[PDB]
Amino acid sequence: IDGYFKIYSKHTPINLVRDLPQGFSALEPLVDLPIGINITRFQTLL
């Protein structure tokens, strides 16, 4: 958003079975850093 690419992380002990239950947990910004480039495509590796 507005040049600043903002990075958010959240680690939880959910271990399958539930299949994405009610995710009332918040999402804090781990870092908010100025990259400054538009994004419209990605791919998540594994």
């Binding site: 507005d2 040049g3 804090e28 910004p29 781990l30 100025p34 400054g36």
Partner: protein, 95 residues
């Protein structure tokens, strides 16, 4: 094809040692500035404070609010900067 400095080590042909800091102001969001004087905070008397760029006047009375690490500053209802995180100490001061 180029040239070469004729640097003879002996009187008016002494060059100078140069570093140039060229500036730009329209390429991206700002990423470089200068240091700002970290003047000591003052408690219990009305002062002219400027914290994290937020400007105002008030009494920076001691407080122990549980600000989360990413919470640069704080506010209250009605969009009022009731609290603020004073840096260099991660301490919370009630405005």
């Amino acid at each position: 094809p180029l040239q070469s400095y004729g640097f003879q080590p002996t009187v008016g042909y002494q060059p100078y040692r140069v570093v140039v800091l060229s500036f730009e102001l329209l390429h991206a969001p700002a990423t470089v500035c200068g240091p700002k004087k970290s003047t000591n905070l003052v408690k219990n008397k009305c002062v002219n404070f400027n914290f994290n760029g937020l400007t105002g006047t008030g009494v920076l009375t001691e407080s122990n609010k549980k600000f989360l690490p990413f919470q640069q500053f704080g506010r209250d209802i009605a969009d009022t900067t009731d609290a603020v995180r004073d840096p260099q100490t991660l301490e919370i001061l009630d405005i």
